[PDB]
Structure 1
Amino acid sequence: ITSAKATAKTVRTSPRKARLVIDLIRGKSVADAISILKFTPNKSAGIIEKVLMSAVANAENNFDLDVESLVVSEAFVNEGPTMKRFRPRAKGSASPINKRTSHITVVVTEK
């Protein structure tokens, strides 16, 4: 009744690098958060921005919250499942590759 959330699951991005961007917006107003993400060149910014914009859309369309007062009350990146690959290395052996994914959640509250 006071908050809305959005999550992007199994996003093909590194959780560690996504958290670098997520840390920039935690506790910030949605308007400030959008500006930060827009001018962050790192890849996860575009993904996080869509999750945030999805959460803001949820707050207005589903719960009729005042968009202009929304703040980022919670934001975190959880590890998704890892796709297992292999890179052939020198002298006939292979080395594993972790192609990691992320669960990204953004919670936004009326104030």
Structure 2
Amino acid sequence: QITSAKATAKTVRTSPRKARLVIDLIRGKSVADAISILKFTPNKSAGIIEKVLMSAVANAENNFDLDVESLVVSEAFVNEGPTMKRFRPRAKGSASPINKRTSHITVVVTEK
């Protein structure tokens, strides 16, 4: 048999450093604690990893498993995606570039 369903979300418009903070608060914790943690952090990268955990839990339910109450978040990644590029007029004629970055967020949910 198998365990550990996956779920990803590609090219999400958040900076990748500011989403590596929230994923440090989940690694190794059960699924019961993690949703409760993510509901009470007022960051933008809270309301995304919520949806990634809920989709991973739903994959594990409605494809393979039972025992929603015995699942543990064992791995979580943030990888960098394709950056947009724009400009901005600085003073005295010149200009300066501006990155606009994207991240790839994955969550793996083993049993225990």
TM-score category of the 2 structures, normalised to the smaller one: over 0.9
- Root mean square deviation, CA, Å: 0.8
Structure 2: state its 5+ residue gaps.
Answer: none
Deviations 1:34-61 (A, max 9, x none): 0111101110010111011111111111
Deviations 1:16-40 (A, max 9, x none): 0000001100111011110111101
Distance 2:70 2:77 in 1: 21
Distance 1:96 1:67 in 2: 47
Q: How many residues align?
A: 111
1:84 aligns with 2:65: no
Distance 1:85 1:66 in 2: 48
Same amino acid, percent of matched pairs: 100
User: What TM-score do the two structures reach when normalised by structure 1?
Assistant: 0.96
CA contact (8 A) 1:65 1:110 kept: no
Following superposition, the deviation at residue 88 of structure 1 comes to 1.3
CA contact (8 A) 1:72 1:106 kept: yes
Following superposition, the deviation at residue 103 of structure 1 comes to 0.1
Deviations 1:36-89 (A, max 9, x none): 111011100101110111111111111124211111010011001101111111
Distance 2:52 2:26 in 1: 12
Distance 1:77 1:95 in 2: 28
Give the secondary-structure state (helix, strand or coil) at the position aligned to 1:47: helix
Moved over 3 A (4+): none
Structure 1: state its 5+ residue gaps.
Answer: none
More helix by share: 1
